[PDB]
Design a protein around this nucleic acid. Structure first.
Lengths: 345, 56
DNA sequence: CTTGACAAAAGTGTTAAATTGTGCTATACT
């Protein structure tokens, strides 16, 4: 069971009081500055050796082995960084352990405040995430608030974390819920509007109107800007939604297929494609083969007058009159045979 | 559950390596560990102390 | 079947306005 799971996993590891807390944060910052210290040792970026710590800490072969088909492999772009600073005197080799223990302590403090992160996401439900999702992204917000925290400021990490958890959650909302991607600001304004509506509803004792609701919204807020985006907001509809009151009918089964031309159109189109071929043969060998090049009948791409006149050796003028006369000259055959007089839609 | 192994000159292992009875710990070959388990290297207590363990 | 001339439609390019994606917020809050 996934529900009870996480709860019983975090309930295993205890919390942290001021002692452990302050200490842990100090350990982390010491490891960080230790990295910056060793960043000048071999000339490696503070972020580089930082992740190089992960290689032997939160997994051996599992951190870099599959971040896709390519990443920073253990033998190639890792090993030469693991056994590089590996030969340095005391004044260097010590910062290694400072970074080891700092890096571990980081994850530690995180695990300690996890019993909070979960209890945080509890209010943020209903977002299209049943708990565990919300909690996960919240845990990410914790990871953020972790490396950005400062113990020196004598602030309880429980305060700093919350403001970031609420962030990584309220952010995950817009990037998950609506089936159609709805950008952050969009949803922001949505919640703003819906808040105003759901508020003045009780105030006026009834529902607002696009004019009066957008009125209390601000400048440039007409009936349109609210009613317009109101459409966007609305999510799609499950094709499994039952239609009628009887248990048979499905939603999706009630939708047509206009994507593919209907058989009646297969013959309707294949008919014109021919009937226009036979009524075409009454044209001169020039004014016909040319009359096709201007309709995209030949190579399927349309050939402008300029090029047609280059193909027949004539001029950008001659082809022009050729089309005119050749065309109406067919209009006579059409108006006299009534074979094609349909297709007038 | 563990055994302490104090040192003087640096160490040949980081925090968490897998050792075995008769392996080189620290001090450039002086102090050796007689038992399995991950080696938790401490700076302040100056000890290469190895906790009884089996990498499973 | 044709030449020069020439409106309209179409094209190449820069900039302005608009849209979209991110990072933070520290009393404490498990």
């Amino acid at each position: 069971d996934p529900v009870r799971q996480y709860l019983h996993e975090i309930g295993q590891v205890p919390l942290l009081t001021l002692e452990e807390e302050i200490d842990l944060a100090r350990k982390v910052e010491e490891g960080m500055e230790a990295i910056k210290k060793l960043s000048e040792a071999t000339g490696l970026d503070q972020e580089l050796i930082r992740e190089v710590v992960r290689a032997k800490i939160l997994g051996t072969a599992r951190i870099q082995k599959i971040p896709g088909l390519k990443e920073k492999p253990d033998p190639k772009t890792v090993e030469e960084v693991d056994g590089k600073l590996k030969s340095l005197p005391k004044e260097l080799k010590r910062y290694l352990h400072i970074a080891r223990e700092g890096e571990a302590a980081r994850q530690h403090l995180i695990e300690a405040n996890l019993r909070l992160v979960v209890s945080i996401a509890k209010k943020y439900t209903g977002r299209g995430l049943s708990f565990l999702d919300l909690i996960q992204e919240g845990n990410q917000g914790l990871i953020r608030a972790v490396e950005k925290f400062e113990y020196k400021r004598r602030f309880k990490f429980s305060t700093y974390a919350t403001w970031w958890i609420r962030q990584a959650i309220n952010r995950a909302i817009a990037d998950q819920a609506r089936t159609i991607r709805i950008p952050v600001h969009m949803v922001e304004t949505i919640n703003k509007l819906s808040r105003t509506a759901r508020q003045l509803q009780q105030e006026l004792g009834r529902e607002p109107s696009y004019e009066e609701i957008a009125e209390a919204m601000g400048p440039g807020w007409d009936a349109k800007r609210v009613e317009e985006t109101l459409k966007i907001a609305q999510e799609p509809v499950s094709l499994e939604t039952p239609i009628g009151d009887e248990k048979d009918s499905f939603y999706g089964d009630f939708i047509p297929d206009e994507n593919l031309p209907s058989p009646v159109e297969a013959a309707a189109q294949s008919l014109l494609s021919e009937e226009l071929e036979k009524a075409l043969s009454k044209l001169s060998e020039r004014e016909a083969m040319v009359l096709k090049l201007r309709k995209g009948l030949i190579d399927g791409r349309e050939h402008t007058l300029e090029e047609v006149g280059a193909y027949f050796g004539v001029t950008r003028e001659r082809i022009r009159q050729i089309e005119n006369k050749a065309l109406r000259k067919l209009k006579y055959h059409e108006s006299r045979t009534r074979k094609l007089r349909d297709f007038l839609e | 559950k563990a055994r302490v192994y104090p040192f003087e000159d640096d160490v040949e292992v980081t925090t968490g390596d897998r050792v075995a009875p008769g392996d080189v710990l620290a001090d450039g070959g002086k102090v050796k560990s007689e038992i399995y388990g991950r080696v938790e290297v401490d700076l302040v207590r100056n000890v290469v102390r190895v906790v009884e363990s089996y990498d499973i």
